[PDB]
C-alpha cells in the first residue's frame, strides 16, 4: 500500500511548521520553569532530560539524587520505593513520590497565557498542551527487572546494549502510595534515532530504511481511529506509547536493515500492524525494558476495549486502511 501510505506521510509533513512553532513556545516556558526551579533547595540541579500526538508535548525534568536504593513494590517489576536538602520529602526511610510531586506542582503554580491541570499539565494559549514529568536520575546499575529487557543484541549490537545499560535510568512519581516507576525515555530516543544494524542507516541514499515512517503511520493509525471512535470512547486508554513499544518489538523481530527497505513500506507497515494485532488479541504487550510488565493486562486495559481495537485494526488491515483515504 505504498501509494496510500506515502500520501499519508506527505500529509503529515504538511503540519511541520505547526508542531515546531507550538513546541517553540513550550521551550521558553520550560526554560523559565527550569530557572526558578533551580532556586529551590530541593530542585537545584534539576535539568532537562517531545511530541506525543499533534500539540501534545512532553518534557521531562531530571533531578540528580545521591546514591539510591530500590525496593520493588510487590511483584510489579516497574514500581519501586526509593531510599538512599531532599530530606523534607521523607516518609520514614522512603522518599515520598506523592509528596515530592506535590512541591514540584506548587512551584510551577506560582511561576505561571498559560494554565494548569506523573505529569503536571500546562496549557499554553489554549491550543498547546504540555506534560512536565519529574524524573529522579540514578547512575546505579539498572534494576533486576530489566535484566531480560532491551533485547537489541541481534539488531543493534550486544556491545550497544552494554553501552546503553551503563547510562543512568529514571524514576517518575507514578504510583501503582509513595511509589515511583522506571523510565528509559532517554534510551527510547537513542534507539529511535540510531536505529539500524548499519551504523550508517539513513545517512546516505543507499541506506534509507522506513523504520521511522512505519512508527509515524502506526502513531497516526491510532490517532485517526481514536478520533473516529470518539462517540463511544472505547479507545481512550491506548496511547502512542503502546504503539512505540510494539514498534520496538517488531524492530527486534526484523533486525536487518534489508527488512526495512524503503521500497517495502507497505509490507513493513503490515508487519507493524500484524504484531500490534497479536498484542491486542493475546492481551500481552511487554514493556521493552521490563518484560514482566504487561501494558495490556486486564489490570490496565479491560478486555472489552482491547477486543474493540482488534476488530477496528483488523478491519482496517483487511481493507487496505480506508481510515487513510482522501
Ligand atoms: N507515556 C508513557 N507510558 C509509559 C512509560 N513507561 C511505561 N508506561 C505505561 O504505558 C501506559 C500508557 O499510558 P499513557 O501514556 O496512555 O498514560 C500514562 C498513564 O496511564 C497516565 C496517568 O494515568 P493514571 O493512572 O490515572 O495516573 P497516575 O498513576 O500516573 O498518577 P500519579 O502520577 O499521581 O501516580 O500518565 C501517562 N504517563 C505515564 N508515564 C508518563 C510519562 O513519563 N510522561 C507522560 N507525559 N505521561 C506519562 C501506562 O500504563 C504507563 O504507565 C513511559 O515512559 N511513558
Ligand atoms: Zn534507517
From Swiss-Prot:
Q: What induces it?
A: By type I interferons.
Residues flagged as site, Important for preferential detection of curved long DNA: 27, 35
Keyword tags? Acetylation, ADP-ribosylation, Antiviral defense, ATP-binding, Cell membrane, Chromosome, Cytoplasm, DNA damage, DNA repair, DNA-binding, GTP-binding, Host-virus interaction, Immunity, Innate immunity, Isopeptide bond, Lipid-binding, Lipoprotein, Magnesium, Membrane, Metal-binding, Methylation, Nucleotide-binding, Nucleotidyltransferase, Nucleus, Palmitate, Phosphoprotein, Transferase, Ubl conjugation, Zinc
Cross-link Glycyl lysine isopeptide (Lys-Gly) (interchain with G-Cter in SUMO) - where? 62, 159, 189, 199, 284
Outcome, altering residue 201 to A: Abolishes DNA binding and enzyme activity
Q: GO annotations under biological process?
A: activation of innate immune response; cAMP-mediated signaling; cellular response to exogenous dsRNA; cGAS/STING signaling pathway; cGMP-mediated signaling; cytoplasmic pattern recognition receptor signaling pathway; defense response to virus; determination of adult lifespan
Amino-acid positions noted as binding Mg(2+) in the UniProt annotation, renumbered to this chain: 56, 58, 131
Report membrane topology: Peripheral membrane protein
Principal localization? nucleus
- The family this protein is said to belong to: Belongs to the mab-21 family.
How are the domains described in the entry? Lys-27 and Leu-35 residues are specific to human and destabilize the interactions with short DNA, shifting the specificity toward the detection of curved long DNAs. Lys-27 and Leu-35 also restrain cGAMP production and, therefore, immune activation, allowing a more fine-tuned response to pathogens. The N-terminal disordered part (1-160) binds unspecifically dsDNA and expands the binding and moving range of CGAS on dsDNA. The disordered and positively charged residues enhance CGAS-DNA phase separation by increasing the valencies of DNA-binding. The N-terminus is required to sense chromatin and its phosphorylation blocks its activation by chromatin DNA. When the N-terminal part (1-160) is missing the protein bound to dsDNA homodimerizes.
Q: What is the protein named?
A: Cyclic GMP-AMP synthase
- What taxonomic lineage is listed for the species of origin? Eukaryota, Metazoa, Chordata, Craniata, Vertebrata
Amino acid at each position: 500500500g505504498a501509494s496510500k501510505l506515502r500520501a499519508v506521510l506527505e500529509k503529515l509533513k504538511l503540519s511541520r511548521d505547526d508542531i515546531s512553532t507550538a513546541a517553540g513556545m513550550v521551550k521558553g516556558v520550560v526554560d523559565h520553569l527550569l530557572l526558578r526551579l533551580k532556586c529551590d533547595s530541593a530542585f537545584r540541579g534539576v535539568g532537562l532530560l517531545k511530541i506525543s500526538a499533534p500539540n501534545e508535548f512532553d518534557v521531562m525534568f531530571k533531578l540528580e539524587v545521591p546514591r539510591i536504593q530500590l525496593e520493588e513494590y510487590s511483584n510489579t517489576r516497574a514500581y519501586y520505593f526509593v531510599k538512599f536538602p531532599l530530606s523534607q520529602f521523607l516518609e520514614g526511610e522512603i522518599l515520598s513520590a506523592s509528596k515530592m510531586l506535590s512541591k514540584f506542582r506548587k512551584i510551577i503554580k506560582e511561576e505561571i497565557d498559560v494554565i494548569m491541570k506523573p505529569a503536571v499539565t500546562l496549557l499554553i494559549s489554549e491550543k498547546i498542551s504540555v506534560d512536565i514529568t519529574l524524573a529522579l536520575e540514578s547512575k546505579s546499575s539498572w534494576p533486576a527487572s530489566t535484566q531480560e529487557g532491551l533485547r537489541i543484541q541481534n539488531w543493534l549490537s550486544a556491545k550497544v546494549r552494554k553501552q546503553l545499560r551503563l547510562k543512568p535510568f529514571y524514576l517518575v512519581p507514578k504510583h501503582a502510595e509513595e511509589t515511583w516507576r522506571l523510565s528509559f525515555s532517554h534510551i527510547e530516543k537513542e534507539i529511535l534515532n540510531n536505529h539500524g544494524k548499519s551504523k550508517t542507516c539513513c545517512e546516505n541514499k543507499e541506506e534509507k530504511c522506513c523504520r521511522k515512517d512505519c512508527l509515524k503511520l502506526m502513531k497516526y493509525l491510532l490517532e485517526q481511529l481514536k478520533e473516529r471512535f470518539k462517540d463511544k470512547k472505547h479507545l481512550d486508554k491506548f496511547s502512542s506509547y503502546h504503539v512505540k513499544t510494539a514498534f520496538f518489538h517488531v524492530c527486534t523481530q526484523n533486525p536487518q536493515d534489508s527488512q526495512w527497505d524503503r521500497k517495502d513500506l507497505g509490507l513493513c507497515f503490515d508487519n507493524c500492524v500484524t504484531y500490534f494485532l497479536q498484542c491486542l488479541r493475546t492481551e500481552k504487550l511487554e514493556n521493552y525494558f521490563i518484560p514482566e510488565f504487561n501494558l495490556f493486562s486486564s489490570n490496565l486495559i479491560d478486555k472489552r476495549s482491547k477486543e474493540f481495537l482488534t476488530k477496528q485494526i483488523e478491519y482496517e488491515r483487511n481493507n487496505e486502511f480506508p481510515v487513510f483515504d482522501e
